[PDB]
Amino acid sequence: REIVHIQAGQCGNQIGAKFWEVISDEHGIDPTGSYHGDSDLQLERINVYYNEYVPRAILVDLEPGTMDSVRSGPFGQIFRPDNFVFGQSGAGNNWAKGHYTEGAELVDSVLDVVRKESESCDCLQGFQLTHSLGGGTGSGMGTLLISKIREEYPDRIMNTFSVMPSPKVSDTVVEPYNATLSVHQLVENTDETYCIDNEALYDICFRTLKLTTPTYGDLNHLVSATMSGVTTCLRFPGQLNADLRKLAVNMVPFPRLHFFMPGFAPLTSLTVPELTQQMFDSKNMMAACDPRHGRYLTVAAIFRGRMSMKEVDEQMLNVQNKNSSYFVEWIPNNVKTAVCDIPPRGLKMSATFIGNSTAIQELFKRISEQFTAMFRRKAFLHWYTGEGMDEMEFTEAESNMNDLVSEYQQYQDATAD
Amino acid sequence: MRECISIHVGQAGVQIGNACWELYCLEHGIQPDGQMPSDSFNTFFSETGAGKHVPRAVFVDLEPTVIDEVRTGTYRQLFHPEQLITGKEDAANNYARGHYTIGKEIIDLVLDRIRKLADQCTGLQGFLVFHSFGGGTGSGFTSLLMERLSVDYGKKSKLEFSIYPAPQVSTAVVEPYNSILTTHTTLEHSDCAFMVDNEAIYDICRRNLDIERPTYTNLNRLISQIVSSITASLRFDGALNVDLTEFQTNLVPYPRIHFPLATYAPVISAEKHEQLSVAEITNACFEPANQMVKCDPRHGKYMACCLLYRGDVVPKDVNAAIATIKTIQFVDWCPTGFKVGINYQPPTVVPGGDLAKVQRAVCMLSNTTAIAEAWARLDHKFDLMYAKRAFVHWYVGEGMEEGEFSEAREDMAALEKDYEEV
Amino acid sequence: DLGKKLLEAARAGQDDEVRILMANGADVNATDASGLTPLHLAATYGHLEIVEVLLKHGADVNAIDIMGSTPLHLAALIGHLEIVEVLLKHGADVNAVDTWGDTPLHLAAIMGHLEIVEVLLKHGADVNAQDKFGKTAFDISIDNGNEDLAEILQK
Numbered sequence: 001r002e003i004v005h006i007q008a009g010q011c012g013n014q015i016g017a018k019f020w021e022v023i024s025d026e027h028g029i030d031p032t033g034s035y036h037g038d039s040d041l042q043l044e045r046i047n048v049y050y051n052e053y054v055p056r057a058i059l060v061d062l063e064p065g066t067m068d069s070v071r072s073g074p075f076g077q078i079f080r081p082d083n084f085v086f087g088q089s090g091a092g093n094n095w096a097k098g099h100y101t102e103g104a105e106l107v108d109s110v111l112d113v114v115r116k117e118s119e120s121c122d123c124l125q126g127f128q129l130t131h132s133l134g135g136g137t138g139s140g141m142g143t144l145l146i147s148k149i150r151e152e153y154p155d156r157i158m159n160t161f162s163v164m165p166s167p168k169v170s171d172t173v174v175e176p177y178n179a180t181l182s183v184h185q186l187v188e189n190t191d192e193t194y195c196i197d198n199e200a201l202y203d204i205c206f207r208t209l210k211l212t213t214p215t216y217g218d219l220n221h222l223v224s225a226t227m228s229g230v231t232t233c234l235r236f237p238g239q240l241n242a243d244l245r246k247l248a249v250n251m252v253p254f255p256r257l258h259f260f261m262p263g264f265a266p267l268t269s270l271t272v273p274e275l276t277q278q279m280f281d282s283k284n285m286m287a288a289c290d291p292r293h294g295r296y297l298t299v300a301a302i303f304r305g306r307m308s309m310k311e312v313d314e315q316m317l318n319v320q321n322k323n324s325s326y327f328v329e330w331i332p333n334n335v336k337t338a339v340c341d342i343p344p345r346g347l348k349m350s351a352t353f354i355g356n357s358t359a360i361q362e363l364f365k366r367i368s369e370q371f372t373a374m375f376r377r378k379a380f381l382h383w384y385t386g387e388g389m390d391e392m393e394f395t396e397a398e399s400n401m402n403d404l405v406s407e408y409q410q411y412q413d414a415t416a417d
Numbered sequence: 418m419r420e421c422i423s424i425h426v427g428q429a430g431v432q433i434g435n436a437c438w439e440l441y442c443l444e445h446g447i448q449p450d451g452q453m454p455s456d457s458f459n460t461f462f463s464e465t466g467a468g469k470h471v472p473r474a475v476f477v478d479l480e481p482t483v484i485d486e487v488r489t490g491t492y493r494q495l496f497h498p499e500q501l502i503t504g505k506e507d508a509a510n511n512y513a514r515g516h517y518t519i520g521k522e523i524i525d526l527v528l529d530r531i532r533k534l535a536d537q538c539t540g541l542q543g544f545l546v547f548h549s550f551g552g553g554t555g556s557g558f559t560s561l562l563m564e565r566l567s568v569d570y571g572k573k574s575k576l577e578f579s580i581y582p583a584p585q586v587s588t589a590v591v592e593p594y595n596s597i598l599t600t601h602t603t604l605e606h607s608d609c610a611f612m613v614d615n616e617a618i619y620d621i622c623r624r625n626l627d628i629e630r631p632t633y634t635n636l637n638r639l640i641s642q643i644v645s646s647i648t649a650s651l652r653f654d655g656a657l658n659v660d661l662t663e664f665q666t667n668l669v670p671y672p673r674i675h676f677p678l679a680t681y682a683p684v685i686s687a688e689k690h691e692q693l694s695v696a697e698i699t700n701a702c703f704e705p706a707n708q709m710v711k712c713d714p715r716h717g718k719y720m721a722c723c724l725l726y727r728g729d730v731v732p733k734d735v736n737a738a739i740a741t742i743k744t745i746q747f748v749d750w751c752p753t754g755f756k757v758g759i760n761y762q763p764p765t766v767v768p769g770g771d772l773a774k775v776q777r778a779v780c781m782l783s784n785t786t787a788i789a790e791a792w793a794r795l796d797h798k799f800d801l802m803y804a805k806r807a808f809v810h811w812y813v814g815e816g817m818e819e820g821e822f823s824e825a826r827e828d829m830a831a832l833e834k835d836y837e838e839v
Numbered sequence: 840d841l842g843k844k845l846l847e848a849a850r851a852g853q854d855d856e857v858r859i860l861m862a863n864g865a866d867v868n869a870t871d872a873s874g875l876t877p878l879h880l881a882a883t884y885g886h887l888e889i890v891e892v893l894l895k896h897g898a899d900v901n902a903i904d905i906m907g908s909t910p911l912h913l914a915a916l917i918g919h920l921e922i923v924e925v926l927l928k929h930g931a932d933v934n935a936v937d938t939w940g941d942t943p944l945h946l947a948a949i950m951g952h953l954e955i956v957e958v959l960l961k962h963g964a965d966v967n968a969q970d971k972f973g974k975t976a977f978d979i980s981i982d983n984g985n986e987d988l989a990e991i992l993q994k
């Protein structure tokens with residue numbers, strides 16, 4: 001039932017706080033933690049994210065100024081004081097500072113807050129972590145956190161919302177190093193990872209929404225809407241009785257292939273057929289990969305609002321039959337639909353898409369080409385080795401991420417025969 | 418006076434069990450608080466000093482959401498708390514988890530609760546076990562329970578009501594794996610199993626009841642009508658199938674191929690009319706559109722056939738309709754008969770449900786080779802995924818070995834050949 | 840040696856240490872183990888002042904290290920715009936090719952330094968230059984699905 005939420009670094013705390021803000025309005029919780037809804041459905045699965053109402057959230061950072069950013073926000077006063085774990089100085093975009101030095105000293109004090117929130121759960125389902133892979137704390141300390149949580153709670157589900165770097169949003173040349181060193185950690189220690197790519201979020205804001213200079217607020221509006229969409233079935237009763245573990249078992253055919261490509265419709269800053277085709281469109285994906293360049297292993301589509309269940313059924317069959325070639329034929333009925341009656345804020349009809357496609361390799365090949373470009377000239381490698389880190393961890397990491405790409409292409413060209 | 422114990426396992430089993438026990442109450446005139454203002458119905462209901470009629474049933478699930486509905490529904494007062502058993506975490510659609518890890522933490526508690534119901538029985542005949550083939554609990558925990566019940570109650574019979582998976586009715590990708598694994602491991606612990614195909618029940622609700630998109634209540638209300646006709650012989654005075662043992666005798670000539678097909682007619686919308694003759698409702702049983710399992714019996718042979726009539730049915734009218742039917746082929750060395758049974762009690766429907774109350778109905782129970790079509794479909798889905806070893810790590814990660822997937826599939830290959838030899 | 844100290848000075852950005860070391864006769868074209876000169880280091884770490892002093896005192900603008908990397912390759916890779924502009928004005932070879940077949944334009948393109956891509960193009964960077972794997976910055980723009988870059992390369 002219960003999920004413990006961990007938010008790490010500046011990106012992690014920003015997207016983290018916008019998540020709590022979005023879902024609190026859906027569940028009718030005001031900033032003081034008091035319920036004010038008009039439906040019993042809002043309070044039925046409140047135990048999942050809230051403690052009796054207070055978010056079951058842990059707030060970590062090495063930079064103490066993000067505490068003040070968090071408290072400043074609309075729902076900043078809702079989080080528990082004891083749950084804030086902060087350092088004296090940030091990681092300066094150094095994954096090694098986050099993973100091996102400053103972060104590793106503070107990491108034990110975080111596990112004591114986790115252990116406190118976890119020991120208070122009726123039956124803990126798992127962990128939800130928000131972070132970026134480009135920085136130092138969220139990527140370096142966060143992956144360390146993941147590692148220590150997995151050794152303490154090996155039977156629990158570990159899920160991440162991981163934001164991938166793009167030069168379009170942060171032109172910091174060390175971020176591909178930080179993302180590659182983290183993707184290596186995520187392949188071994190997460191059950192499910194939602195790959196939110198800042199390149200995709202920038203291309204949607206810039207080209208589709210036409211925002212000339214998008215801010216983190218414009219990017220985070222899509223991350224928050226995606227986060228609400230994918231967690232819908234965990235938070236509301238409907239025709240589906242499921243948790244993070246059932247999602248994992250049916251979404252992950254092979255252990256390492258647990259990187260999901262989420263999408264949302266409609267895109268903001270409508271009929272059922274128009275919503276269905278948009279969900280399988282590259283312009284609605286939160287990862288910059290063309291889904292028509294690969295094949296889907298598994299797909300989950302959560303629809304939200306009042307609509308004809310029959311129209312949702314036939315339109316979803318109409319896609320598969322028309323586009324037989326994009327779905328692997330060796331996983332029978334690999335497209336699952338869930339229709340939830342409660343729509344999101346300011347809309348009467350929404351669709352959320354969760355794909356496990358072989359086209360995700362495009363996102364990884366982008367990060368690898370950048371890593372490689374920098375790693376060949378040995379650029380800034382001293383910043384990392386100076387924090388007590390081996391040079392061969394850079395080669396472990398690249399090698400592992402390159403293996404992942406090979407697996408995806410293996411299963412993309414595999415026939416049923 | 419021979420008692421029957423019903424075990425309802427997982428979501429599907431509990432939800433169909435709720436539909437059943439509500440319908441038995443309407444048939445026997447028992448109130449939602451267990452009081453009855455008026456032997457036969459005592460096979461299914463024990464009595465308390467206070468005059469309460471308590472179902473002889475156990476509801477089990479590894480997570481409580483479903484059973485909590487029962488603890489606050491119309492029949493909250495019908496079951497004592499101890500008959501409703503729940504864990505805090507489910508098998509997550511994984512047979513291994515329901516059988517080897519999570520299921521082992523609660524099997525003992527469940528056996529104590531069954532032993533409490535059994536010590537209240539003067540002549541326990543056996544158990545009726547309801548479950549999905551697809552769920553982690555429905556598949557894994559049930560197979561664990563069937564193994565243990567063979568040891569602790571070795572001379573008693575076990576009948577099953579199993580829900581076969583259908584893509585139209587919210588199935589999980591791994592349901593073909595769970596289905597094959599539970600079948601393999603239960604094949605020697607069950608005496609007779611009535612499969613219910615969710616695709617069949619779903620097409621009947623659409624075709625015959627005009628429902629645009631059925632939900633589990635619609636499907637379950639129809640299912641419970643079929644289950645009640647099968648169990649009517651055990652809860653009323655009767656000539657045919659009066660004890661669990663007679664089901665094997667009448668329907669199962671060969672022990673491994675113990676999956677009879679059930680057909681029910683007439684299925685009429687409460688909206689829709691005149692009344693159907695005994696001849697017409699009998700003919701409907703041979704129409705493939707009325708079967709609990711999607712298969713063509715005209716592309717197969719019969720090993721056994723039972724017709725169970727309910728309501729205003731004169732025996733001479735049946736003999737005429739059966740005579741017409743002979744003028745459909747049988748297995749080589751088996752007899753070419755029909756066993757008929759008549760209960761003159763009118764068929765009951767849930768007040769304000771989707772089914773129309775009719776004057777006469779029939780349930781035909783047949784054991785036909787055409788049911789192998791259902792196994793062929795499941796095995797094919799298993800083969801496509803297993804060739805690539807898709808999803809297998811979830812199973813081996815929960816105490817299972819890969820060799821078990823192979824034994825199970827071999828057992829199904831051998832069951833497909835058993836149907837082809839017969 | 841005075842060259843070893845000069846290299847550390849250029850890397851560390853010490854403007855005054857650089858000037859003092861050269862006054863005492865330090866090898867302005869000294870190299871470290873990898874074949875890097877004070878100009879490469881200065882160019883890698885964004886020390887434009889040192890880049891200027893070195894170019895005025897006999898620094899080989901088109902020097903190469905063990906892998907064929909010139910200062911311009913590195914300034915483009917890390918994305919120091921003013922440093923790219925100074926090197927070009929002082930005779931940096933816009934189309935220099937390293938051991939991987941990479942030009943400074945390939946690197947600007949890969950790292951997404953779009954302002955540098957414009958500056959290199961305006962200074963005669965060859966858009967038709969292919970690397971060891973046969974890819975041009977235009978090809979890289981297709982593979983990575985980067986329409987912002989594709990548009991800059993179509994002129």
Ligand SMILES: Nc1nc2c(ncn2[C@@H]2O[C@H](COP(=O)(O)OP(=O)(O)OP(=O)(O)O)[C@@H](O)[C@H]2O)c(=O)[nH]1
Nearest residue numbers: 427428429432507508510549551552553554555586
């Ligand atoms: N007819 C019918 N089918 C159902 C019902 N509930 C679930 N199913 C089917 O049963 C399968 C899913 O198994 P469940 O019973 O929900 O699972 P479970 O036994 O609780 O096991 P877990 O995996 O532990 O949740 C699918 O084929 C569903 O279509 C129901 O009430 N009626």
Ligand SMILES: COc1cc2c(c(OC)c1OC)-c1ccc(OC)c(=O)cc1[C@@H](NC(C)=O)CC2
Nearest residue numbers: 233242246247250299300334336338587589590
């Ligand atoms: C808690 O949230 C979810 C949990 C699950 C699923 C899902 O997608 C609708 C969810 O919403 C995102 C799910 C996913 C995909 C499946 O196959 C592709 C499947 O077999 C089955 C499912 C779900 N089962 C059904 C019948 O929809 C169970 C796991």
Ligand SMILES: Nc1nc2c(ncn2[C@@H]2O[C@H](COP(=O)(O)OP(=O)(O)O)[C@@H](O)[C@H]2O)c(=O)[nH]1
Nearest residue numbers: 009010011014132134135136137138170216219
């Ligand atoms: N979309 C999004 N990206 C962000 C946000 N904050 C930081 N980033 C990205 O995260 C990376 C920097 O990570 P950061 O969290 O600031 O470092 P940390 O605080 O040490 O973990 C860069 O790729 C930034 O674009 C945010 O609020 N939203």
Ligand SMILES: [Mg+2]
Nearest residue numbers: 241427428507
């Ligand atoms: Mg269940």
